Write a protein that binds this DNA or RNA. Structure first.
Ligand SMILES: [Mg+2]
Lengths: 585, 37, 76
DNA sequence: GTCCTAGGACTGCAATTTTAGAGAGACGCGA
DNA sequence: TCGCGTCTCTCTAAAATTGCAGTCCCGCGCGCCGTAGGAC
RNA sequence: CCGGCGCGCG
């Protein structure tokens, strides 16, 4: 056997600004959402028709926001451990101060020559750098070479990431790790940082990801039909970015960065920024994560069509493979099949006429519904599905009322009782689903529980009491006779049950039954109480529950079983069930 | 608590499916009760 | 070749190490080690006549060492 | 009246917050 | 004329708390209340 | 056809 190979994959990856532009190409420039008067999409706004599409494509077409200054991605700076800090090999405090405070970084780039002895992150502004150097070097040329020795904000971070030599990083980390090893709490943590840094730098070499994509130059904009809260955060980015380009000052640069962080991930900077109602905003991370997020609520579980619900009532006359469906639920679930049945036999001119006929509850609609429900299974399901037997397949039949009729023997698997429980019904539409439901999910091939293998559809409660009373034998000993004793004989079980029907004997009155089969009565392994041996050869062996007549002359052997009508009835019920099933096939 | 426990229990082994007739292993756990065997 | 092998197995003649090696000779140059590894997994946990030989191991190793991206030293 | 209008509970874990261990440059006293 | 514990920091190895991050059954039904603020 | 609050059923 050669396996039917299927090679399908999906891969996430950090995106590039060029790919963001390719997504948009289409830039959102104005923070206006909708017209206050005409209720029309404002041009170049968050809902622009030119950018996103005419008012299907509005669910998929993306836009972008051209940020004047680069802003770091909050996931890769503020989340612990910081990826940017590890790759740049600097403490998180100094990086956060460079991004959030008025700090300037000395020597941000290396692949271009410099002429200054400025190293580290000088918190205070350099007094000479304020006037002396710019006034001697004028303005145009100074600004031309400005962003090569001193810079600040996320731009410095992006410059540091862009010119990083990953192979040099790996080699330096390895040599430092060896030095540390050749020499005890953070003597190990520094090693663990070193191991984490080379593994982080190694992954960038083999992939197409660039470490500078960790700082955003463009901001993709969600399609409008997916945001008919998120819109408010998008306006702020445009609100503070468009202010920044008007200036072209450091404070507004930080405001744009905070707007993006709040849009991307709130509740990560300690105090999460709230709205005017003192309520925390919801970011993309919030809507994709959590139990109520996209992954665990929209993708792992879905609401479906062709489904119904009603209260469960017991039907003891149902078969093990059948269920009762309310007429309204059935006509709703099988509506398309009823329409096809109406049109097929020329009783409906078109689909609209058939739907109108169904809406009027015509008496011929129910004939077609009954016809099309034959052979089409349904799936029942109780609410707390704890194992796979919590959903099973049955053959629906039309029952009067508004309740779902359920077999009593399948309640244990559903963990259902008839005190207010409800169930959902589903209709398999395609032929493959119908075959799956018929051949895998019906109750008659699911008699055993998968946990350990015990039967699941075993009689319980009322049936158990009935069987116990039926098979509870005779009163014996002092409970049968007032005094120390110092019963009818039936040819066959039918005679005994007939006598019981005519009230000649009780359910637990003792009787002797002629046995014409082998000895197959479960009884204690005991010798006869009494053997009555006759001088003619015949002897009678009297046991606790049967009498056996034997002879030395012949090979005859007669057996009489002392029992009640209840034991006979149980045995006949099982025997007749087997014989009837055999004959019917 | 059981609902949280069940979700973590199913999650850790959700990918386990009978995919081969015989892996070809020779190792065998040694046993020296009836319902287990 | 894959279509003919599928048809041959449908006709009642199961694939052996020879046919699997023939198939692997082309998968090893596709640049995706997972195809060759899927074929190798099919061979390794199958019947006696499908078991890998030196040529099969060579094909899978060549597929892994000449991969387009990611590291494969652990796999090799 | 209003029309635009801008504070559990448990676990995990890196991050301080020391505690400590050694330790040395300049030294006031001293041999 | 230097030599001696040593004054005054001094810089980092090694635990010791400590402040977040993460999570904490499933499936149904019904009702109410939002959408605010200010110079006219 | 959007979310919060309250009350319930299994
Ligand atoms: Mg109940």
């Amino acid at each position: 056997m050669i396996d039917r190979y299927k090679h399908q994959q999906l891969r996430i990856g950090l995106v590039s600004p060029q790919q963001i532009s390719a997504w948009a190409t289409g830039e959102v420039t104005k923070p206006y959402t909708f017209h206050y008067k005409t209720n029309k999409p404002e041009k170049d706004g968050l809902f622009c028709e030119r950018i996103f599409g005419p008012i299907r494509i509005r669910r998929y077409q993306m836009g972008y926001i051209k940020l004047t200054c680069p802003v770091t991605h909050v996931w890769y700076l503020k989340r612990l451990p910081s990826y940017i800090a590890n790759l740049l090999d600097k403490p998180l405090k100094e990086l956060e101060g460079l991004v959030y405070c008025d700090f300037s970084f000395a020597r941000p780039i290396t692949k271009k020559p410099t002429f200054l002895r400025l190293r580290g992150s000088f918190e205070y502004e350099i007094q000479s750098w304020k006037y002396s150097i710019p006034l001697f070097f004028t303005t145009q040329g100074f600004e031309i070479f400005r962003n090569r020795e001193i810079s600040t904000g996320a731009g410095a971070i992006r410059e540091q990431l862009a010119d990083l030599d990953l192979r040099i990083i790996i080699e330096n980390s390895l040599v430092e790790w060896k030095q540390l090893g050749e020499e005890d709490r953070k003597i190990v943590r520094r090693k663990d940082f070193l191991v984490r840094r080379m593994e982080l730098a190694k992954h960038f070499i083999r992939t197409n990801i660039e470490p500078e994509w960790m700082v955003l130059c463009l901001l993709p904009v969600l399609p409008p039909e997916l945001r008919p809260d998120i819109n408010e955060l998008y306006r702020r980015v445009i609100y503070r970015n468009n202010t920044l380009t008007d200036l072209l000052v450091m404070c507004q640069e930080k405001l744009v960065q905070e707007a993006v962080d709040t849009l991307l991930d709130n509740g990560i900077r300690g105090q999460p920024m709230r709205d005017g109602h003192n309520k925390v905003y919801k970011s993309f991370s919030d809507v994709i994560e959590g139990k109520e997020g996209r992954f665990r609520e929209t993708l792992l579980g879905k609401r479906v069509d062709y489904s119904g619900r009603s209260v469960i009532v017991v039907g003891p006359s149902l078969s093990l493979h059948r269920c009762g469906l309310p007429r309204e639920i059935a006509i709703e679930l099988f509506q398309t099949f009823v329409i096809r049945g109406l049109i097929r036999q020329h009783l409906a001119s078109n689909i609209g006429v058939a739907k109108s006929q169904i809406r009027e509850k015509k008496p011929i609609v129910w004939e077609i519904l009954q016809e099309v429900m034959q052979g089409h299974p349904v799936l029942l399901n109780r609410a707390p599905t704890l194992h796979r037997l919590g959903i099973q397949s049955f053959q629906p039949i039309l029952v009067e009322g508004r309740t779902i009729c359920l077999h009593p023997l399948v309640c244990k698997g559903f963990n259902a009782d008839f005190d207010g429980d409800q169930m959902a019904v589903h209709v398999p539409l395609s032929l493959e689903a119908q075959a799956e439901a018929r051949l895998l999910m019906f109750s008659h091939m699911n008699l055993l529980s998968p946990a350990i293998g015990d039967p699941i559809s075993v009689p319980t409660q009322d049936m158990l009491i009935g069987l116990y009373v039926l098979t509870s034998g005779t009163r014996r000993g002092i409970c049968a006779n007032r005094y120390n004793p110092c019963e009818p004989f039936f040819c066959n079980s039918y005679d005994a049950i007939g006598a019981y029907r005519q009230k000649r004997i009780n359910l637990d009155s003792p009787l002797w039954l002629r046995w014409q089969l082998d000895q197959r009565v479960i009884a204690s392994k005991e010798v006869p109480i009494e053997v009555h041996y006759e001088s003619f050869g015949n002897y009678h062996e009297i046991y606790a529950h049967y009498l056996i007549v034997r002879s030395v002359k012949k090979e005859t052997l007669y057996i009489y079983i002392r029992t009640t009508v209840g034991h006979i009835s149980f045995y006949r019920e099982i025997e007749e069930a087997i014989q009837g099933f055999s004959q019917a096939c | 608590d059981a609902g949280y426990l069940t979700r973590r229990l199913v999650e850790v082994v959700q990918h386990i499916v009978v995919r081969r007739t015989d892996c070809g292993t020779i190792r065998g756990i040694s046993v020296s009760f009836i319902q287990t065997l | 070749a894959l279509d003919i092998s599928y048809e041959m197995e449908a006709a009642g003649r199961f694939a052996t190490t020879f046919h699997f090696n023939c198939l692997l000779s082309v998968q090893a140059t596709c640049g995706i080690p997972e195809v060759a590894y899927a074929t190798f997994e099919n061979m390794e946990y199958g019947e006696d006549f499908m078991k890998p030989d030196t040529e099969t191991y060579n094909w899978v190793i060549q597929a892994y060492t000449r991969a387009d991206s990611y590291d494969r030293v652990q796999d090799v």
